[PDB]
Amino acid sequence: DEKYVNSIWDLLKNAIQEIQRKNNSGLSFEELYRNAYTMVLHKHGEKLYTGLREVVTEHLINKVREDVLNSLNNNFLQTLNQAWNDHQTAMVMIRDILMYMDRVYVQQNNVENVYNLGLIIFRDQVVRYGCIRDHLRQTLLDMIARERKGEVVDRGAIRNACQMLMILGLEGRSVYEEDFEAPFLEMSAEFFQMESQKFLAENSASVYIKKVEARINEEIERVMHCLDKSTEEPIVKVVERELISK
Amino acid sequence: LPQEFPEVVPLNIGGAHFTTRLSTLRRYEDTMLAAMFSGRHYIPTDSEGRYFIDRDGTHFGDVLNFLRSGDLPPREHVRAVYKEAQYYAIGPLLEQLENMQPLKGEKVRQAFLGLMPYYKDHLERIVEIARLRAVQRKARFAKLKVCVFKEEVDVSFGPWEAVADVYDLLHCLVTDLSAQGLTVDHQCIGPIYEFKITWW
Amino acid sequence: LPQEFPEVVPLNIGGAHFTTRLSTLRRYEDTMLAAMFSGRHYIPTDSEGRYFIDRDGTHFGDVLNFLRSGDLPPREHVRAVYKEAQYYAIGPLLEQLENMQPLKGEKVRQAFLGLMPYYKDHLERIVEIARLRAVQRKARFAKLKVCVFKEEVDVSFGPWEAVADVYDLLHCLVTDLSAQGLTVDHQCIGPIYEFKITWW
Amino acid sequence: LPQEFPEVVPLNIGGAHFTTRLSTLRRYEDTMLAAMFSGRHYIPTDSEGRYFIDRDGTHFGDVLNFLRSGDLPPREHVRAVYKEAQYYAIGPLLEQLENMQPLKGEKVRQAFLGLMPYYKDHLERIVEIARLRAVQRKARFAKLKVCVFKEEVDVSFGPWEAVADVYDLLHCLVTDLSAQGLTVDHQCIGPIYEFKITWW
Amino acid sequence: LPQEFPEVVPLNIGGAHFTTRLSTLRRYEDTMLAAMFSGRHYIPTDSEGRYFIDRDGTHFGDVLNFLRSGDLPPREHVRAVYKEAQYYAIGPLLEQLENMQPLKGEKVRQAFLGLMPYYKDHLERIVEIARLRAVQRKARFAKLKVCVFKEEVDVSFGPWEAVADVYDLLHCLVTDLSAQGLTVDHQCIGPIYEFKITWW
Secondary structure, three states: OHHHHHHHHHHHHHHHHHHHOOOOOOOOHHHHHHHHHHHHHOOOHHHHHHHHHHHHHHHHHHHHHHHHHHOOOOOHHHHHHHHHHHHHHHHHHHHHHOHHHHHHHHHHOOOOOHHHHHHHHHHHHHOOOHHHHHHHHHHHHHHHHHHHHOOOOOHHHHHHHHHHHHHHOOOOOHHHHHHHHHHHHHHHHHHHHHHHHHHHHHOOHHHHHHHHHHHHHHHHHHHHHHOOOOOHHHHHHHHHHHHHOO | OOOOOOOEEEEEEOOEEEEEEHHHHOOOOOOHHHHHOOOOOOOOEOOOOOEEEOOOOOOHHHHHHHHHOOOOOOOOOHHHHHHHHHHHOOHHHHHHHHOOHHHHHHHHHHHHHOOOOOHHHHHHHHHHHHHHHHHHHOOOEEEEEEEEOOOOOOEEEOOOOOOOOHHHHHHHHHHHHHHOOOEEEEEEOOOEEEEEEEOO | OOOOOOOEEEEEEOOEEEEEEHHHHOOOOOOHHHHHOOOOOOOOEOOOOOEEEOOOOOOHHHHHHHHHOOOOOOOOOHHHHHHHHHHHOOHHHHHHHHOOHHHHHHHHHHHHHOOOOOHHHHHHHHHHHHHHHHHHHOOOEEEEEEEEOOOOOOEEEOOOOOOOOHHHHHHHHHHHHHHOOOEEEEEEOOOEEEEEEEOO | OOOOOOOEEEEEEOOEEEEEEHHHHOOOOOOHHHHHOOOOOOOOEOOOOOEEEOOOOOOHHHHHHHHHOOOOOOOOOHHHHHHHHHHHOOHHHHHHHHOOHHHHHHHHHHHHHOOOOOHHHHHHHHHHHHHHHHHHHOOOEEEEEEEEOOOOOOEEEOOOOOOOOHHHHHHHHHHHHHHOOOEEEEEEOOOEEEEEEEOO | OOOOOOOEEEEEEOOEEEEEEHHHHOOOOOOHHHHHOOOOOOOOEOOOOOEEEOOOOOOHHHHHHHHHOOOOOOHHHHHHHHHHHHHHOOHHHHHHHHOOHHHHHHHHHHHHHOOOOOHHHHHHHHHHHHHHHHHHHOOOEEEEEEEEOOOOOOEEEOOOOOOOOHHHHHHHHHHHHHHOOOEEEEEEOOOEEEEEEEOO
């Protein structure tokens, strides 16, 4: 009983790790699925579940957490996007392996599914760390300022980062908001506060109106290209309030 | 590798040959058959064009029928196709099969027997005690005493809060024991109920 | 493309191997099999010379038998071959199947039950209310009241104009409920009829 | 052209796979199987060397058994193998099957019913008058009057010269109608007999 | 030679085709199938990729089902799958099948009949003595006298120490003889019991 369970658990753990390292699986899908299905039937879902947590934590906290920590200034957005793509693909494959878990085991415990569990682990561990939060906020603010200042950056990369931030939360905008939007809102407010005084001093009434319209159009274009569409309206409203009502 | 599957998929289910379209397998996206044939996983062939699944194929026909259209199995195949759908993780098939009679009454009675998570353990204790007594004493029948109360005994079934009476539990015991093949007779010895099981 | 078919057509019906002549398939011009094998559509083969139809092939033998000669199923496969003929749109087969007994009495009774288009919904309501009461109360049986009048109740069957009596509809209710596997007993509580369904 | 056949003849009977020797098929010279395999006709091969016969192969095993030895089908398969032997024009098989019980009693009763060539037409007429009455009135049962005499009536059975009485014809009516799946009761209303057929 | 086996093993069990993964066959280390497919023995193929085992494959499906997962056969297939498990030396399957009813009661009664190792020999002596008497005298039934004592006779069942009474052994005699197809009636002629076996 227990010895066979341990053997096929070693098998499943090797398969999960070997998937996480992006190589062709030695075994087949059906064998691993049968192993997981038998584990769940015999009410050994606790040990498989904890082993899945251990392996994903080993691959995130001990691997990609230190990768992003060791790559703060070396393509931070690019390495974050690569880690996000790897996590999504790996969790899709693992969720395919463990569908019977989704059908019963995680549903009597009312916990979120394997893909949702992986999303929550990703957000909690490698989204909510203070160092990576401040670094991503700084990088997003620098990219936004460079776009405003006229410097050309990868808009597709920022769009991918926004998509990752939006999907990091469990079907909610809380993650993207508390991660970037508040720092983005503050940076936009400061920039608009400076620009309002600059345009009032340098430009006449019609010229100031034209400058405010151009700034609003630029903000709308930036939102369309490399930002969330849902949060575009509050940003536009804040920009209009700061530029015009001041 | 992102495999490309033929539109007509030759299937080998534990030595039984089935053939179905690729659209049939991917009909429900959250299913064993859909994830297996989604193309993300490598699928082994078996000396032919057949694709191998290591499970009994006697009742895979009804699973394929439910994938093609809304067809449901007959009565005697409800339980076997339910077992198959559990393996293949076909949620809609599981729901429609649990809405059919052989499993519907079982769910209704599990609503009662779920008040007592020790029911199956106590049943196995009854069977084992009867077998041990019959073998050690070298008899045909073993008589054991059970105590069933709603609010010296070998096996006791404790209190429960429901509208099913004590005599309804004894119906569960005799029916479950008889479903195991045992010949069971129960009598109120005086609340202790004496159970007699005749092995031969 | 104007596909050319061999005179002897190998057939693969959901993994079941059949062989028949082209004239047999094209025997009735207005049919799935005739239109499929009319040469106006491209038909996919399955790793062999056989042509593939993603359908259950257990009762395709009787369909082929009817196409060859005016043969009919032997009174146990009337309903299954009726489903097959419905799928294949074989009109004469449907007519001679509806003139056979298992479906003939069903059409005769549907003549009466056609006066009430809400009948099946009311059976589903009866079963669901009984199941909900049994599960919530944790009982073996659920008793519900129905009101049947020809000219506080859970389910009511309204007026109808026919020569069938009130007791004939209760026969339809009990037989249909028993055809679902339920154990049903009805009593005239006083016109309100109390129905008791025993789940276990 | 004179076709040459292998000594071991591979056979495909409507998708069913059989194998037999050429001597077995040519055992009776005046037969479908002998004339087909006499070599004077061209027989198609179905892409795998088999020789194709567009006919149901379920009971061709008993035909091959009678061609090999004098073996006769079991009691249940008498009628189906009789139908097969009629198609294959195997005379001795037809004789020995008509000499076996399911067909022997039927021949004996057709000796009586041969005096009345309108018997089957009148049975049908009974069935559709009952069906139209039940459908039009929307009833469960249809009552129709029949007049049976040895020497306002819906169906009349005329005179006959035999030793079977009037009540023996009524046995033929009820048994034949019951064999059709109908539920039939009769009584002497006063000689006019009232037949009641219950559809449901 | 150390033979390399494919991960998907095709199997030929006495003309019956099964396909299973290599992991399924090697699931239990101490079995026929594990030793056969361990790689220390040369396994013969049969004109294909199939691996040949010279035994009946009707109930090998249940053996494969148990090897894949702990699935037990239905009650009617307990004995045949038990014989298969004895041949393949699958110990866990033997245990689970000996804890199922068709064999559990047999073990319980063998606990009693194990006190008399001459039981089956005496049953045989009864059967051929009755047969010899019936054939020699040319009768339909043969009457023989047996002596059963717990503490001039053809067959005698000696003393035993158990709680089963004399009449319980007579139940073993009649049931075992009836299980052989014989029609057996016993009467206490006066302890000498007279058994009448009716051959026709």
